mmCIF file of all heavy atoms in Angstrom:
data_model
loop_
_atom_site.group_PDB
_atom_site.id
_atom_site.type_symbol
_atom_site.label_atom_id
_atom_site.label_comp_id
_atom_site.label_asym_id
_atom_site.label_seq_id
_atom_site.Cartn_x
_atom_site.Cartn_y
_atom_site.Cartn_z
ATOM 1 N N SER X 1 188.472 -33.113 80.379
ATOM 2 C CA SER X 1 189.458 -32.613 81.318
ATOM 3 C C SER X 1 189.448 -31.091 81.306
ATOM 4 O O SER X 1 189.147 -30.461 80.287
ATOM 5 C CB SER X 1 190.856 -33.141 80.983
ATOM 6 O OG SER X 1 191.846 -32.455 81.728
ATOM 7 N N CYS X 2 189.780 -30.511 82.458
ATOM 8 C CA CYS X 2 189.783 -29.062 82.648
ATOM 9 C C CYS X 2 190.958 -28.716 83.557
ATOM 10 O O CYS X 2 190.901 -28.951 84.766
ATOM 11 C CB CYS X 2 188.460 -28.598 83.245
ATOM 12 S SG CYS X 2 188.425 -26.894 83.845
ATOM 13 N N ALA X 3 192.018 -28.169 82.971
ATOM 14 C CA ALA X 3 193.188 -27.736 83.721
ATOM 15 C C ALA X 3 192.972 -26.318 84.231
ATOM 16 O O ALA X 3 192.640 -25.412 83.455
ATOM 17 C CB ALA X 3 194.442 -27.797 82.849
ATOM 18 N N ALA X 4 193.174 -26.128 85.531
ATOM 19 C CA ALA X 4 192.950 -24.848 86.179
ATOM 20 C C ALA X 4 194.279 -24.217 86.561
ATOM 21 O O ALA X 4 195.252 -24.912 86.868
ATOM 22 C CB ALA X 4 192.074 -25.005 87.423
ATOM 23 N N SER X 5 194.313 -22.889 86.523
ATOM 24 C CA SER X 5 195.514 -22.160 86.895
ATOM 25 C C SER X 5 195.121 -20.759 87.334
ATOM 26 O O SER X 5 194.034 -20.270 87.015
ATOM 27 C CB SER X 5 196.511 -22.106 85.736
ATOM 28 O OG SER X 5 196.107 -21.151 84.773
ATOM 29 N N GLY X 6 196.031 -20.116 88.065
ATOM 30 C CA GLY X 6 195.814 -18.775 88.556
ATOM 31 C C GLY X 6 195.168 -18.681 89.920
ATOM 32 O O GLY X 6 195.055 -17.571 90.458
ATOM 33 N N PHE X 7 194.736 -19.799 90.498
ATOM 34 C CA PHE X 7 194.114 -19.781 91.813
ATOM 35 C C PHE X 7 194.360 -21.114 92.501
ATOM 36 O O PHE X 7 194.705 -22.111 91.861
ATOM 37 C CB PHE X 7 192.610 -19.490 91.726
ATOM 38 C CG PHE X 7 191.800 -20.631 91.173
ATOM 39 C CD1 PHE X 7 191.044 -21.434 92.011
ATOM 40 C CD2 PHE X 7 191.796 -20.900 89.814
ATOM 41 C CE1 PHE X 7 190.301 -22.483 91.504
ATOM 42 C CE2 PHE X 7 191.053 -21.943 89.301
ATOM 43 C CZ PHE X 7 190.304 -22.737 90.146
ATOM 44 N N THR X 8 194.173 -21.120 93.817
ATOM 45 C CA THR X 8 194.343 -22.333 94.614
ATOM 46 C C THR X 8 193.182 -23.273 94.323
ATOM 47 O O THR X 8 192.068 -23.082 94.815
ATOM 48 C CB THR X 8 194.429 -21.999 96.097
ATOM 49 O OG1 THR X 8 195.515 -21.092 96.313
ATOM 50 C CG2 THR X 8 194.672 -23.258 96.906
ATOM 51 N N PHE X 9 193.452 -24.295 93.507
ATOM 52 C CA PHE X 9 192.397 -25.186 93.034
ATOM 53 C C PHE X 9 191.761 -25.968 94.178
ATOM 54 O O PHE X 9 190.543 -26.178 94.191
ATOM 55 C CB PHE X 9 192.974 -26.128 91.976
ATOM 56 C CG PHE X 9 191.969 -27.056 91.366
ATOM 57 C CD1 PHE X 9 191.046 -26.591 90.444
ATOM 58 C CD2 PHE X 9 191.979 -28.407 91.680
ATOM 59 C CE1 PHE X 9 190.130 -27.448 89.868
ATOM 60 C CE2 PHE X 9 191.067 -29.271 91.107
ATOM 61 C CZ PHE X 9 190.139 -28.791 90.199
ATOM 62 N N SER X 10 192.562 -26.379 95.163
ATOM 63 C CA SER X 10 192.065 -27.222 96.245
ATOM 64 C C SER X 10 191.195 -26.473 97.244
ATOM 65 O O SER X 10 190.662 -27.104 98.165
ATOM 66 C CB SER X 10 193.235 -27.869 96.984
ATOM 67 O OG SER X 10 194.208 -26.898 97.328
ATOM 68 N N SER X 11 191.035 -25.161 97.100
ATOM 69 C CA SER X 11 190.264 -24.368 98.046
ATOM 70 C C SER X 11 188.887 -23.992 97.520
ATOM 71 O O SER X 11 188.161 -23.253 98.194
ATOM 72 C CB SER X 11 191.039 -23.103 98.427
ATOM 73 O OG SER X 11 192.317 -23.435 98.943
ATOM 74 N N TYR X 12 188.508 -24.478 96.341
ATOM 75 C CA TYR X 12 187.226 -24.142 95.745
ATOM 76 C C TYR X 12 186.579 -25.399 95.185
ATOM 77 O O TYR X 12 187.259 -26.296 94.681
ATOM 78 C CB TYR X 12 187.388 -23.091 94.638
ATOM 79 C CG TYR X 12 187.868 -21.748 95.138
ATOM 80 C CD1 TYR X 12 189.187 -21.353 94.978
ATOM 81 C CD2 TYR X 12 186.999 -20.879 95.782
ATOM 82 C CE1 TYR X 12 189.626 -20.125 95.440
ATOM 83 C CE2 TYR X 12 187.425 -19.649 96.245
ATOM 84 C CZ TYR X 12 188.740 -19.276 96.074
ATOM 85 O OH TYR X 12 189.164 -18.051 96.538
ATOM 86 N N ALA X 13 185.254 -25.454 95.279
ATOM 87 C CA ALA X 13 184.509 -26.507 94.612
ATOM 88 C C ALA X 13 184.509 -26.260 93.107
ATOM 89 O O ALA X 13 184.845 -25.172 92.632
ATOM 90 C CB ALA X 13 183.078 -26.577 95.142
ATOM 91 N N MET X 14 184.155 -27.295 92.348
ATOM 92 C CA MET X 14 184.129 -27.184 90.896
ATOM 93 C C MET X 14 182.823 -27.751 90.362
ATOM 94 O O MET X 14 182.142 -28.530 91.032
ATOM 95 C CB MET X 14 185.325 -27.896 90.254
ATOM 96 C CG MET X 14 186.666 -27.402 90.763
ATOM 97 S SD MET X 14 187.030 -25.736 90.188
ATOM 98 C CE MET X 14 187.006 -25.981 88.416
ATOM 99 N N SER X 15 182.479 -27.345 89.139
ATOM 100 C CA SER X 15 181.219 -27.745 88.533
ATOM 101 C C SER X 15 181.393 -27.960 87.035
ATOM 102 O O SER X 15 182.323 -27.450 86.410
ATOM 103 C CB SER X 15 180.122 -26.703 88.787
ATOM 104 O OG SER X 15 180.129 -26.280 90.137
ATOM 105 N N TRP X 16 180.472 -28.736 86.475
ATOM 106 C CA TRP X 16 180.348 -28.959 85.041
ATOM 107 C C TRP X 16 178.938 -28.551 84.636
ATOM 108 O O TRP X 16 177.962 -29.045 85.216
ATOM 109 C CB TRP X 16 180.606 -30.426 84.682
ATOM 110 C CG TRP X 16 182.049 -30.817 84.629
ATOM 111 C CD1 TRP X 16 182.745 -31.500 85.582
ATOM 112 C CD2 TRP X 16 182.969 -30.572 83.560
ATOM 113 N NE1 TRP X 16 184.044 -31.689 85.179
ATOM 114 C CE2 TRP X 16 184.209 -31.127 83.941
ATOM 115 C CE3 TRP X 16 182.869 -29.936 82.321
ATOM 116 C CZ2 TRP X 16 185.337 -31.065 83.128
ATOM 117 C CZ3 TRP X 16 183.992 -29.873 81.514
ATOM 118 C CH2 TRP X 16 185.210 -30.434 81.922
ATOM 119 N N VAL X 17 178.839 -27.648 83.655
ATOM 120 C CA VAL X 17 177.569 -27.140 83.144
ATOM 121 C C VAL X 17 177.560 -27.305 81.628
ATOM 122 O O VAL X 17 178.536 -26.954 80.961
ATOM 123 C CB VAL X 17 177.363 -25.659 83.520
ATOM 124 C CG1 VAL X 17 176.042 -25.142 82.981
ATOM 125 C CG2 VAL X 17 177.448 -25.468 85.027
ATOM 126 N N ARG X 18 176.466 -27.826 81.079
ATOM 127 C CA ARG X 18 176.389 -28.070 79.645
ATOM 128 C C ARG X 18 175.272 -27.254 79.010
ATOM 129 O O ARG X 18 174.318 -26.836 79.671
ATOM 130 C CB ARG X 18 176.188 -29.557 79.329
ATOM 131 C CG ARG X 18 174.768 -30.052 79.468
ATOM 132 C CD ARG X 18 174.728 -31.569 79.394
ATOM 133 N NE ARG X 18 173.421 -32.094 79.766
ATOM 134 C CZ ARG X 18 173.039 -33.348 79.574
ATOM 135 N NH1 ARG X 18 173.848 -34.238 79.024
ATOM 136 N NH2 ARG X 18 171.818 -33.719 79.948
ATOM 137 N N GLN X 19 175.410 -27.039 77.702
ATOM 138 C CA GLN X 19 174.437 -26.307 76.898
ATOM 139 C C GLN X 19 174.135 -27.113 75.645
ATOM 140 O O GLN X 19 175.028 -27.341 74.821
ATOM 141 C CB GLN X 19 174.968 -24.920 76.520
ATOM 142 C CG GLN X 19 173.935 -23.988 75.904
ATOM 143 C CD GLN X 19 174.557 -22.696 75.404
ATOM 144 O OE1 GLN X 19 175.685 -22.688 74.913
ATOM 145 N NE2 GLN X 19 173.818 -21.598 75.516
ATOM 146 N N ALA X 20 172.882 -27.543 75.509
ATOM 147 C CA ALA X 20 172.459 -28.301 74.346
ATOM 148 C C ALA X 20 172.397 -27.387 73.126
ATOM 149 O O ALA X 20 172.262 -26.169 73.258
ATOM 150 N N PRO X 21 172.527 -27.953 71.923
ATOM 151 C CA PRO X 21 172.434 -27.138 70.704
ATOM 152 C C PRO X 21 171.126 -26.369 70.615
ATOM 153 O O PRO X 21 170.057 -26.964 70.447
ATOM 154 C CB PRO X 21 172.546 -28.181 69.585
ATOM 155 C CG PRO X 21 173.378 -29.257 70.190
ATOM 156 C CD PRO X 21 172.895 -29.346 71.619
ATOM 157 N N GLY X 22 171.202 -25.043 70.740
ATOM 158 C CA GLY X 22 170.031 -24.198 70.671
ATOM 159 C C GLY X 22 169.285 -24.019 71.975
ATOM 160 O O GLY X 22 168.406 -23.150 72.051
ATOM 161 N N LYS X 23 169.602 -24.803 73.000
ATOM 162 C CA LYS X 23 168.918 -24.732 74.278
ATOM 163 C C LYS X 23 169.732 -23.900 75.270
ATOM 164 O O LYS X 23 170.761 -23.304 74.930
ATOM 165 C CB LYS X 23 168.652 -26.143 74.805
ATOM 166 C CG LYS X 23 167.462 -26.832 74.161
ATOM 167 C CD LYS X 23 166.870 -27.876 75.100
ATOM 168 C CE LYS X 23 165.454 -28.264 74.693
ATOM 169 N NZ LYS X 23 165.364 -28.695 73.268
ATOM 170 N N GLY X 24 169.260 -23.850 76.518
ATOM 171 C CA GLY X 24 169.896 -23.060 77.548
ATOM 172 C C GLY X 24 170.931 -23.849 78.327
ATOM 173 O O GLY X 24 171.235 -25.004 78.034
ATOM 174 N N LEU X 25 171.477 -23.195 79.347
ATOM 175 C CA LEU X 25 172.497 -23.806 80.182
ATOM 176 C C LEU X 25 171.856 -24.774 81.168
ATOM 177 O O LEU X 25 170.746 -24.551 81.658
ATOM 178 C CB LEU X 25 173.276 -22.734 80.941
ATOM 179 C CG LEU X 25 174.180 -21.836 80.098
ATOM 180 C CD1 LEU X 25 174.748 -20.702 80.943
ATOM 181 C CD2 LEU X 25 175.290 -22.658 79.469
ATOM 182 N N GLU X 26 172.573 -25.856 81.463
ATOM 183 C CA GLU X 26 172.096 -26.881 82.384
ATOM 184 C C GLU X 26 173.256 -27.339 83.253
ATOM 185 O O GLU X 26 174.270 -27.816 82.734
ATOM 186 C CB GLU X 26 171.494 -28.068 81.622
ATOM 187 C CG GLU X 26 171.029 -29.229 82.500
ATOM 188 C CD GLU X 26 170.855 -30.524 81.717
ATOM 189 O OE1 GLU X 26 171.461 -30.649 80.631
ATOM 190 O OE2 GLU X 26 170.114 -31.418 82.186
ATOM 191 N N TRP X 27 173.117 -27.176 84.566
ATOM 192 C CA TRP X 27 174.128 -27.670 85.491
ATOM 193 C C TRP X 27 174.152 -29.195 85.466
ATOM 194 O O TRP X 27 173.109 -29.846 85.574
ATOM 195 C CB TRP X 27 173.847 -27.161 86.901
ATOM 196 C CG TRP X 27 174.729 -27.746 87.961
ATOM 197 C CD1 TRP X 27 175.999 -27.357 88.286
ATOM 198 C CD2 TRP X 27 174.399 -28.818 88.850
ATOM 199 N NE1 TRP X 27 176.478 -28.125 89.321
ATOM 200 C CE2 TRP X 27 175.516 -29.031 89.683
ATOM 201 C CE3 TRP X 27 173.269 -29.623 89.021
ATOM 202 C CZ2 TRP X 27 175.533 -30.013 90.670
ATOM 203 C CZ3 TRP X 27 173.291 -30.598 90.001
ATOM 204 C CH2 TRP X 27 174.413 -30.782 90.814
ATOM 205 N N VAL X 28 175.343 -29.762 85.312
ATOM 206 C CA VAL X 28 175.511 -31.202 85.164
ATOM 207 C C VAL X 28 176.043 -31.841 86.437
ATOM 208 O O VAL X 28 175.481 -32.819 86.930
ATOM 209 C CB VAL X 28 176.430 -31.511 83.962
ATOM 210 C CG1 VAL X 28 177.022 -32.908 84.085
ATOM 211 C CG2 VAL X 28 175.659 -31.376 82.685
ATOM 212 N N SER X 29 177.138 -31.312 86.981
ATOM 213 C CA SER X 29 177.772 -31.992 88.103
ATOM 214 C C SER X 29 178.547 -31.006 88.960
ATOM 215 O O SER X 29 178.873 -29.903 88.526
ATOM 216 C CB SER X 29 178.706 -33.103 87.612
ATOM 217 O OG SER X 29 179.043 -33.985 88.664
ATOM 218 N N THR X 30 178.872 -31.437 90.177
ATOM 219 C CA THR X 30 179.657 -30.619 91.089
ATOM 220 C C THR X 30 180.461 -31.517 92.016
ATOM 221 O O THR X 30 180.012 -32.597 92.411
ATOM 222 C CB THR X 30 178.779 -29.672 91.917
ATOM 223 N N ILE X 31 181.657 -31.049 92.363
ATOM 224 C CA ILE X 31 182.552 -31.751 93.270
ATOM 225 C C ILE X 31 183.086 -30.761 94.296
ATOM 226 O O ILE X 31 183.302 -29.579 94.001
ATOM 227 C CB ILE X 31 183.700 -32.448 92.504
ATOM 228 C CG1 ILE X 31 184.402 -33.474 93.395
ATOM 229 C CG2 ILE X 31 184.679 -31.425 91.936
ATOM 230 C CD1 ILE X 31 185.486 -34.235 92.691
ATOM 231 N N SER X 32 183.290 -31.254 95.516
ATOM 232 C CA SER X 32 183.696 -30.421 96.635
ATOM 233 C C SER X 32 185.180 -30.063 96.551
ATOM 234 O O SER X 32 185.913 -30.506 95.663
ATOM 235 C CB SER X 32 183.385 -31.123 97.954
ATOM 236 O OG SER X 32 183.750 -32.490 97.902
ATOM 237 N N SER X 33 185.627 -29.266 97.526
ATOM 238 C CA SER X 33 187.010 -28.799 97.553
ATOM 239 C C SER X 33 187.997 -29.946 97.707
ATOM 240 O O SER X 33 189.101 -29.891 97.154
ATOM 241 C CB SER X 33 187.205 -27.796 98.691
ATOM 242 O OG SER X 33 186.270 -26.736 98.617
ATOM 243 N N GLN X 34 187.620 -30.998 98.433
ATOM 244 C CA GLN X 34 188.506 -32.133 98.653
ATOM 245 C C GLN X 34 188.274 -33.275 97.675
ATOM 246 O O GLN X 34 189.094 -34.198 97.623
ATOM 247 C CB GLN X 34 188.337 -32.674 100.081
ATOM 248 C CG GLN X 34 188.196 -31.612 101.164
ATOM 249 C CD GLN X 34 186.752 -31.169 101.356
ATOM 250 O OE1 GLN X 34 185.863 -31.570 100.603
ATOM 251 N NE2 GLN X 34 186.515 -30.335 102.364
ATOM 252 N N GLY X 35 187.198 -33.231 96.894
ATOM 253 C CA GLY X 35 186.893 -34.292 95.960
ATOM 254 C C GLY X 35 186.199 -35.491 96.564
ATOM 255 O O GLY X 35 186.048 -36.510 95.880
ATOM 256 N N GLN X 36 185.763 -35.401 97.820
ATOM 257 C CA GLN X 36 185.111 -36.534 98.475
ATOM 258 C C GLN X 36 183.658 -36.658 98.026
ATOM 259 O O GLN X 36 183.285 -37.611 97.335
ATOM 260 C CB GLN X 36 185.197 -36.371 99.998
ATOM 261 C CG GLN X 36 186.486 -35.725 100.501
ATOM 262 C CD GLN X 36 187.599 -36.735 100.745
ATOM 263 O OE1 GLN X 36 187.453 -37.642 101.567
ATOM 264 N NE2 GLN X 36 188.715 -36.582 100.037
ATOM 265 N N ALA X 37 182.829 -35.692 98.409
ATOM 266 C CA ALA X 37 181.401 -35.726 98.134
ATOM 267 C C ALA X 37 181.108 -35.054 96.796
ATOM 268 O O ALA X 37 181.588 -33.946 96.533
ATOM 269 C CB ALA X 37 180.627 -35.046 99.264
ATOM 270 N N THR X 38 180.324 -35.728 95.953
ATOM 271 C CA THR X 38 179.994 -35.239 94.623
ATOM 272 C C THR X 38 178.482 -35.241 94.440
ATOM 273 O O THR X 38 177.756 -35.968 95.122
ATOM 274 C CB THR X 38 180.642 -36.089 93.520
ATOM 275 O OG1 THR X 38 179.791 -37.196 93.213
ATOM 276 C CG2 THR X 38 181.992 -36.621 93.963
ATOM 277 N N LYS X 39 178.014 -34.418 93.502
ATOM 278 C CA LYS X 39 176.594 -34.300 93.200
ATOM 279 C C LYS X 39 176.385 -34.226 91.694
ATOM 280 O O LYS X 39 177.201 -33.654 90.968
ATOM 281 C CB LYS X 39 175.981 -33.065 93.866
ATOM 282 N N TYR X 40 175.276 -34.802 91.231
ATOM 283 C CA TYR X 40 174.948 -34.862 89.814
ATOM 284 C C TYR X 40 173.498 -34.451 89.598
ATOM 285 O O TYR X 40 172.729 -34.263 90.543
ATOM 286 C CB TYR X 40 175.180 -36.267 89.238
ATOM 287 C CG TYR X 40 176.527 -36.855 89.571
ATOM 288 C CD1 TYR X 40 176.711 -37.609 90.719
ATOM 289 C CD2 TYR X 40 177.613 -36.669 88.727
ATOM 290 C CE1 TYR X 40 177.942 -38.148 91.025
ATOM 291 C CE2 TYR X 40 178.850 -37.204 89.027
ATOM 292 C CZ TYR X 40 179.009 -37.943 90.177
ATOM 293 O OH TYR X 40 180.238 -38.480 90.484
ATOM 294 N N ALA X 41 173.139 -34.304 88.328
ATOM 295 C CA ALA X 41 171.770 -34.046 87.912
ATOM 296 C C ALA X 41 171.066 -35.363 87.611
ATOM 297 O O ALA X 41 171.702 -36.385 87.343
ATOM 298 C CB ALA X 41 171.737 -33.136 86.685
ATOM 299 N N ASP X 42 169.730 -35.328 87.659
ATOM 300 C CA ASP X 42 168.956 -36.557 87.497
ATOM 301 C C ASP X 42 169.171 -37.181 86.124
ATOM 302 O O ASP X 42 169.224 -38.410 85.994
ATOM 303 C CB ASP X 42 167.469 -36.277 87.728
ATOM 304 C CG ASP X 42 167.181 -35.756 89.123
ATOM 305 O OD1 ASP X 42 167.705 -36.341 90.098
ATOM 306 O OD2 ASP X 42 166.428 -34.761 89.241
ATOM 307 N N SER X 43 169.322 -36.352 85.089
ATOM 308 C CA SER X 43 169.525 -36.879 83.745
ATOM 309 C C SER X 43 170.908 -37.485 83.555
ATOM 310 O O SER X 43 171.101 -38.274 82.622
ATOM 311 C CB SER X 43 169.291 -35.774 82.715
ATOM 312 O OG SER X 43 169.921 -34.567 83.115
ATOM 313 N N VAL X 44 171.869 -37.145 84.412
ATOM 314 C CA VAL X 44 173.224 -37.674 84.307
ATOM 315 C C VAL X 44 173.579 -38.634 85.432
ATOM 316 O O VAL X 44 174.629 -39.294 85.350
ATOM 317 C CB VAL X 44 174.271 -36.543 84.223
ATOM 318 C CG1 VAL X 44 173.939 -35.610 83.072
ATOM 319 C CG2 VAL X 44 174.338 -35.784 85.534
#
């Protein structure tokens, strides 16, 4: 879970990015401003 504050949450898309131990950053998932259409990575 990720609680957001300080900005209009419903007006921006959101993303999840992960970093493996010792490795680099990897984009995991994304959701649109309304939460309808979502996108993921092939490994997830």
